[PDB]
Structures are given as C-alpha cells and as structure tokens.
A paper describes a structure:
Val47 backbone forms a H-bond with an adjacent protein molecule, and therefore crystal packing contributes to stabilization of “open” conformation of the Gly44-Ser51 loop.
It has two different enzymatic activities: microbial cell walls destruction (muramidase activity), and dissolution of the stabilized fibrin (isopeptidase activity). The main difference between low and high salt structures as well as between the two chains of high salt structure is tied to a flexible loop (Gly44-Ser51), containing enzymatically important Asp46.
Author numbering: 21 to 138
Write the structure that this text describes.
Amino acid sequence: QFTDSCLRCICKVEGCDSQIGKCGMDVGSLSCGPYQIKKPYWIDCGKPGGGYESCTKNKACSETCVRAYMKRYGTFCTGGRTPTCQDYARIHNGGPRGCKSSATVGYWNKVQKCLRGT
Ligand SMILES: [Cl-]
Ligand SMILES: [Cl-]
C-alpha cells in the first residue's frame, strides 16, 4: 500500500507546506501546492475538490488526489506486481509509466534520502 511515510517524503521533495496556496510554472507547466500537482494529474486522480486550483493548492485535498492516483496507477505501472514507495514516487514524478522510466530514478533517490534522514 501507499503509506503516509511515502507520501510525506514525496511532499518534502516537492516543497510541502511552503507551497500551500501557491502555483507556479517554473518547472515547465502549471504545478500547484505541496505536491506540485499538474492539471492532467488532477484529472487522472478523479478531479477531487472544488476545481484544479482549489484542490491542489490545499494540502488535504492534494493528499486525497495523490492517494487516489497511487491506488489507480501503481499496479498499472508495475504490470501487476505489488508496488513499493519507489514505484509510487516515480509515478508521482513521471506519470503512469514513471516507475519504468530512467528519468525518474533521480527523483526516487531524493525521496529515498528523505526516508533515510539524509
Ligand atoms: Cl520502497
Ligand atoms: Cl534518464
């Protein structure tokens, strides 16, 4: 299962409480809030909340979205194998195929340093 420890370390790498109420475009598309959720991710997690900006600026609604996204795409990305936090963090960063993409390994390494207290 996608755990609170996994979620917390994804939050930390994305900016977490410092991004409550905030959106930005510096990553290359619009990303909002403590988990830096983009609009297609909010569509894919089931459009929780009052709207994209309303949900993803808010920590609790963002966590509803992330949890739904991991439940929906985790075993999709792994092809049926039980997912781990490595898979969940890599699909947060890279999309539903992210757990297989070399481009998300660096992101997992940052999450894993949080899980190790580095
Ligand atoms: Cl793991
Ligand atoms: Cl790469």
